[PDB]
């Protein structure tokens, strides 16, 4: 209702860096909020694309940011009569960034990996990897749960089971309040997709530089399947967490599988052992139902609701004609031991090719009326196609169909304004939560502040 559109703050990265592809609020030990920005096409120190992360301190004037430095040197280890190799070129460091306590986790989903052994190899493949940083100490750690030392032939001999070579770990990511890092790896198990979880503390304590293949004993990975419904489902394209089984002691995970069951798409609510609690099926093929997932209590009953985005949903129109506009599905959580039902509300975009529902951000209580609110992105929406972010306030009945406020892109065409969003954090300490929007095409991030 009251994000200020006139008094924006622009943070900028280098040209062609995709500064703003991903972002999050990060809070230091003192409590001072900053903004972590991922820039997955940033040139490294040798003029080759590696990606990078920037840690922006809060300023009204905005501007340039300092780089959160990470090791961009390739590694080679000759051990156990094998040769391990990491390849950081075009790895897309900062394709996802997430913050937790005093830690920042930035991932490079397309970091490649190979293992040579005489004339054979595992194959040079994008296992992905996450770089963990604790800025106030300087400590660095990595996590790359899909690396293996199994050779090419053995996979063939076992019908490509448990094949983690193409995981792209860190494609999506989220952290629980306790400090469990959960990564989406949609290329997992020969493109079915998997999730990998491990405590942040245990990632840090088990990592040493140069080892490349190490054990994180507390880690837990999801499972391979022979159910054709899961084939090419990209299970883990998006990931989120919340409370969906009533037991406050346990944490539930929400996984997006946008191409699940022959491109029908699906989102799953799972326990922390990766057992399915519920499955939400997509409405229309190729709509990418599961591209985005968001969890927040919007109707004020204290039960987390679920929001799923299908940005390529084609809407019906006069004379049997379809129109790609995007759609978002609201699922309110009922009382007792009951599953989630049909959508309580369908929010459909209006601009052709707008990709409404490409990003869904919980805003917290933007106007302090008692109900939590959300922001939905249409990165190519608005009359001109420059992009749009629509604010929806919560109420007892769920959400309003009509947005409370529309944010038009201040950047030129192709910025992808809204492709990434984040809220629920008061960056200027005025008591109201604020919204940060990324425009990777324009190499920038816009900060909208909330007012009385």
């Amino acid at each position: 209702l009251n994000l200020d559109p006139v008094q924006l703050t622009f943070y900028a990265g280098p040209n062609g860096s995709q500064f703003g592809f991903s972002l999050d609020f990060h809070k230091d030990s003192h409590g001072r909020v900053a903004i972590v920005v991922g820039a997955p096409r940033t040139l490294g120190p040798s003029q080759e694309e590696t990606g990078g992360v920037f840690l922006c301190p809060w300023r009204a004037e905005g501007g340039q940011c300092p780089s959160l430095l990470f090791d961009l040197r390739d590694e080679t280890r000759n051990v156990g009569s094998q040769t391990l190799q990491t390849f950081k070129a075009r790895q897309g460091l900062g394709a996802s960034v997430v913050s937790w306590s005093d830690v920042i986790v930035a991932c490079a989903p397309w970091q490649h990996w190979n293992v040579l052994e005489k004339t054979e190899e595992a194959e040079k493949t994008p296992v992905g990897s996450c770089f963990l940083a604790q800025p106030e100490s300087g400590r660095r750690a990595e996590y790359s749960p899909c690396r293996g030392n199994t050779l090419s032939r053995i996979y063939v001999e076992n019908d490509f089971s448990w094949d983690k070579r193409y995981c792209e770990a860190g494609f999506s990511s989220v952290v629980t309040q306790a400090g469990e890092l959960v990564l989406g790896a949609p290329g997992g198990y020969y493109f079915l997709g998997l999730l990998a979880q491990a405590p942040v503390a245990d990632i840090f304590s088990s990592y040493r530089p140069g080892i490349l293949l190490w054990h994180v004993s507390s880690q837990s990975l999801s499972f391979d399947s022979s159910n054709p419904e899961y084939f090419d489902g990209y299970w883990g394209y998006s990931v989120a967490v919340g409370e969906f089984d009533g037991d406050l002691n346990t944490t539930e995970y929400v996984v997006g599988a946008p191409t699940w069951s022959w491109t029908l798409g699906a989102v799953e609510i799972l326990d922390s052992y990766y057992q399915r609690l519920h499955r939400l099926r997509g409405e229309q093929m190729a709509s990418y139902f599961g591209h985005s997932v968001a969890v927040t209590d919007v109707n004020g009953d204290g039960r987390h609701d679920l929001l799923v985005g299908a940005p390529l949903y084609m809407e019906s129109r006069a004379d049997r004609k379809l129109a790609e506009v995007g759609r978002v599905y609201l699922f309110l959580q009922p009382r007792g031991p009951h599953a989630l039902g049909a959508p309580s509300l369908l929010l459909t975009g209006t601009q052709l090719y707008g990709r409404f529902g490409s990003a869904i951000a919980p805003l917290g209580d933007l106007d302090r009326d008692g109900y939590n609110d959300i922001a939905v992105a249409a990165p190519y929406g608005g009359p001109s196609g420059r992009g749009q972010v629509l604010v929806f306030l919560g109420q007892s009945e769920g959400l309003r169909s009509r947005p409370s406020q529309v944010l038009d892109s201040p950047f030129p065409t192709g910025s992808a304004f809204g492709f990434s969003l984040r809220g629920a954090v008061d960056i200027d300490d005025n008591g109201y939560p604020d919204l940060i929007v990324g425009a990777y095409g324009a190499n920038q991030v816009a900060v909208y502040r909330a007012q009385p």
Partner: antibody, heavy 119, light 108 residues
């Protein structure tokens, strides 16, 4: 607390076989490679081989190929070493080993199993 | 196979001394070396992995160093518990191979 619990001392006859066991406590045996090592007062430490209990695949020093068969069972969280065609050279203390973090390391050791081959 | 030659086979040293045990590989093993301790009549404990990394719980007075084919384990300010046997193991290549051993012994 990671701890490898090996089976008790063996007194066996030449030409026979023996099978030593190594049960994981405080962790799952499929978590890492499990190695088997031989120790003798004069000859010192010799590496016999390893198993990846997740999939059963093994590696052996050519010296022990044929004599040693390493196996593992994830149902009982136990790894095994079987020595066939026992000789006086097989009188030794046998250890199972696993790494802490580094896949390839030799960090945690069992308490050892003594085998004595005699008539 | 890689031959690991450990030196000395024994040394006679005192409490509070700083001592080094060396291990020479027959070829480069780029830090793929571990150091092990065996106390009298006891089993093995890992001290260092990958050349310089202390195993969890190992006291700071132990340290590893070296590169290529030549490595050292240094114990600083010997404790009475440190009078034991020490072995290097390489895992650069299969078969893994061990050094001969070094026995720390009380000087009198």
């Amino acid at each position: 607390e990671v701890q490898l619990q090996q089976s008790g001392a063996e007194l066996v006859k030449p030409g026979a076989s023996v099978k030593l066991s190594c049960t994981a406590s405080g962790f799952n045996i499929k978590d890492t490679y499990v190695h088997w090592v031989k120790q003798r007062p004069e000859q010192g430490l010799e590496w016999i081989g390893r198993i990846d209990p997740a999939n059963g695949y093994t590696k052996y020093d050519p010296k022990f190929q044929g004599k040693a068969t390493i196996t593992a069972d994830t149902s009982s969280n136990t790894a095994y070493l079987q020595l066939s065609s026992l000789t006086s050279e097989d009188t030794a203390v046998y250890y199972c080993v696993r790494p802490l973090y580094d896949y390839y390391a030799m960090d945690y050791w069992g308490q050892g199993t003594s085998v004595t081959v005699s008539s | 196979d890689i031959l690991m030659t450990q030196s000395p086979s024994s040394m006679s040293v005192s409490l509070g001394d700083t001592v080094s045990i060396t291990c020479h590989a027959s070829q480069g093993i780029s830090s793929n070396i571990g150091w092990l301790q065996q106390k009298p009549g006891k089993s093995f404990m890992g001290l260092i992995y990958y050349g310089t990394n202390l195993v969890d719980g190992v006291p700071s007075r132990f340290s590893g160093s070296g590169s290529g084919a030549d490595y050292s384990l240094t114990i600083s300010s010997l404790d009475s518990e440190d009078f034991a046997d020490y072995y290097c193991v390489q895992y650069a290549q299969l078969p893994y191979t061990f050094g001969g051993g070094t026995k720390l012994e009380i000087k009198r």
